Write a protein that binds this DNA or RNA. Structure first.
Ligand SMILES: [Ca+2]
Ligand SMILES: [Ca+2]
Ligand SMILES: [Cl-]
Length: 238
DNA sequence: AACCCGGAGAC
DNA sequence: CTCCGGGTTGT
């Protein structure tokens, strides 16, 4: 694994911007929201996930399309350590509905954003006692507990891309034009409790093709507009 | 299995 | 806010 110096990241970010719009290789294309991230990784020579460390060594690398209305940033994924499993939560709270991409395919889905301070429409909420005890409740009923390790996101390099071409098409292209270094991470108990940090469940199942469920892992996420509540220091790199 | 890479529109 | 995907890695 290469450990990128801060200066090497800055230099590389300028080189990347200077390349203009980058294309999706034919063999990479898979009708995939995440392709912006795959393209950005390739530019940093990131060849596989590393279990211990952020992608760049000291920093975790994240790419995002610069949408006017911007989806949350996914920080990382983690299964609950105790209580109900994600498949058990899916069994109970999932709902049957056509695929949003392909209306002719019937799915069972649980795509839900769960947060502290409020019950969502499915009755789900979070509370945290410590960072290693984040609990999922359905109403006043305890379900599960997460023990989250924040180590990999202590420092981020977040890079925004402009796009041309249809979203998730083979012709989609990406110009990385802005980037930020985020550091001095805050304790997350209050951020969970106050609904700044959220947890998305992203499980579905292709019933039409008689397939098993696909649990994409509980996603810890945060709106881009609230990054200043998670990190005390945000520095423009590009 | 349990992580990885990320999205949309309504009001 | 409700609601939404594509993968590989580890057993
Ligand atoms: Ca990674
Ligand atoms: Ca990354
Ligand atoms: Cl689980």
């Amino acid at each position: 694994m290469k450990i990128w110096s801060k200066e090497e990241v800055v230099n590389k970010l300028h080189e990347i911007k200077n390349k203009g719009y980058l294309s999706v290789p034919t063999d990479m294309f898979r009708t995939d929201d995440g392709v912006v991230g795959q393209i950005l990784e390739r530019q940093f020579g990131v060849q596989e996930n590393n279990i211990t460390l952020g992608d760049l060594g000291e920093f975790e690398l994240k790419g995002m399309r610069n949408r006017k209305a911007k989806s949350n940033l996914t920080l990382f994924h983690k299964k609950p350590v105790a209580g109900q499993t994600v498949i058990q939560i899916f069994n109970r709270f999932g709902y049957v509905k056509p695929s949003s991409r392909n209306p002719e395919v019937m799915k069972k889905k649980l795509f839900t954003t769960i947060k502290g301070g409020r019950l969502n429409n499915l009755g789900l909420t979070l509370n945290a006692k410590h960072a290693s005890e984040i609990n999922l409740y359905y109403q006043d009923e305890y379900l599960s507990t997460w023990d989250l390790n924040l180590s990999k996101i202590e420092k981020l390099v977040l890079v925004f891309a402009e796009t041309i071409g249809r979203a998730n098409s083979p012709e989609e292209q990406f110009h990385f034009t802005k980037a930020y270094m985020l550091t001095e991470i805050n304790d997350i108990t209050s951020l969970i409790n106050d609904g700044v940090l959220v947890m998305d469940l992203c499980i579905d199942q292709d019933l039409s093709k008689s397939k098993g469920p696909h649990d994409r892992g509980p996603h810890l996420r945060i709106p881009i507009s609230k990054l200043d509540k998670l990190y005390r220091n945000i520095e423009r790199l590009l």
